[PDB]
Design a binder for this molecule. Structure first.
Ligand code: HEC
Ligand code: HEC
Ligand code: HEC
Ligand code: HEC
Ligand code: HEC
Ligand code: HEC
Length: 158
């Protein structure tokens, strides 16, 4: 018999999530999660990220105190939701967006989903759009973060 295996959560329309028994077993024993938090049966009891904020499922520990909050860092549990360096193909060459640099100042919620969706290429914007406050322009306005009005080389390889 082998230890419980890594669990895969299949969601239609959403990037799958994963749970590592091995990693958590380095900290807990079976009864700390079974059966108050999760059952031992193949019986589903599907939860939402909301239920988690309400202390259920992964949220029982991933609350910002016991373990990192399940409200952010989606890429830690959702492999497909991993923030990466983005490259845009524009009419004047490539433009880039580095998540890592921004993650040293903001949390996922600061941009997702009010400003951007977790999907590149969704709502394309022109620099003019940005100058009016859209896309990067929401912050890069020369008052909060540096403006998009000049120093194109900051984001462009022209
Ligand atoms: C919380 C940190 C856990 C600890 C410690 C252990 N398990 Fe676990 N287990 C946990 C989760 C999040 C899940 C997924 C539940 C889901 O909604 O799909 C599981 C699943 C299992 C299963 C599979 C049962 C099934 O869904 O049909 C088994 C058989 C199981 N866990 C066994 C098990 C044992 C023996 C543990 C101690 C060695 C153990 N788990 C610890 C969360 C956690
Ligand atoms: C690990 C602690 C997680 C973090 C952090 C995030 N999510 Fe998650 N998500 C996780 C699991 C195990 C599941 C499935 C739970 C189940 O019982 O099946 C999910 C599910 C979702 C869903 C579908 C349900 C819903 O609330 O709509 C979505 C849309 C989803 N997760 C999105 C998401 C985002 C955007 C996150 C960061 C802001 C995020 N998750 C973090 C586990 C974890
Ligand atoms: C309490 C019994 C927990 C439950 C239930 C779940 N997790 Fe957990 N998780 C817990 C701790 C104490 C930690 C370590 C501290 C930290 O915040 O990192 C974690 C860590 C993880 C991680 C990151 C691991 C790493 O490489 O550092 C992930 C990806 C993770 N946990 C996912 C996860 C999911 C998907 C859960 C619900 C299915 C879940 N955890 C439950 C404590 C507990
Ligand atoms: C604003 C400063 C951001 C923060 C903070 C985070 N993300 Fe992000 N993300 C941002 C942009 C501009 C885009 C492009 C959207 C578009 O319309 O093209 C994205 C895109 C993503 C995606 C999909 C592409 C990818 O990077 O793989 C994901 C999966 C994503 N972002 C995840 C993510 C997570 C988990 C964050 C916090 C840890 C996060 N983003 C923060 C801008 C910003
Ligand atoms: C980062 C803060 C930027 C600065 C500074 C400038 N641009 Fe930009 N530009 C950036 C991105 C990420 C994108 C793609 C946006 C998308 O939704 O796809 C672009 C795109 C353009 C485009 C194509 C779209 C259009 O406006 O027609 C052009 C022609 C362009 N950018 C030119 C440009 C010039 C000349 C700049 C300095 C005056 C400039 N950009 C700055 C991000 C950023
Ligand atoms: C507010 C939530 C922001 C969004 C949305 C985007 N950026 Fe940003 N960016 C922001 C800050 C606060 C900073 C730090 C510097 C400052 O102006 O105070 C940055 C920094 C960058 C950089 C790197 C600058 C450097 O370290 O030299 C670049 C090139 C940049 N940002 C580009 C960029 C693009 C293309 C964005 C839209 C896809 C984007 N940022 C959104 C704040 C915010």
């Amino acid at each position: 018999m082998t230890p419980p295996k890594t669990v895969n959560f299949k969601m239609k329309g959403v990037a799958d999530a994963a749970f590592s028994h091995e990693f958590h077993l380095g900290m807990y024993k079976c009864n700390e999660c079974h059966t108050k938090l999760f059952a031992y049966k193949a019986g589903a009891k599907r939860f939402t990220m909301a239920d988690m904020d309400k202390g259920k499922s992964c949220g029982a520990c991933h609350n910002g105190k016991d373990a990192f909050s399940s409200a952010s860092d989606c890429g830690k549990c959702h492999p497909g939701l991993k923030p990466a360096k983005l490259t845009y193909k524009t009419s004047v060459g490539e433009a880039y967006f580095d998540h890592d640099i921004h993650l040293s100042m903001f949390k996922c919620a600061d941009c997702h989903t009010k400003v951007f969706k977790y999907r590149k290429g969704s709502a394309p914007a022109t620099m003019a759009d940005m100058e009016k406050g859209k896309s990067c322009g929401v912050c890069h306005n020369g008052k909060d973060a540096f403006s998009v009005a000049d120093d194109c080389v900051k984001c462009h390889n022209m």
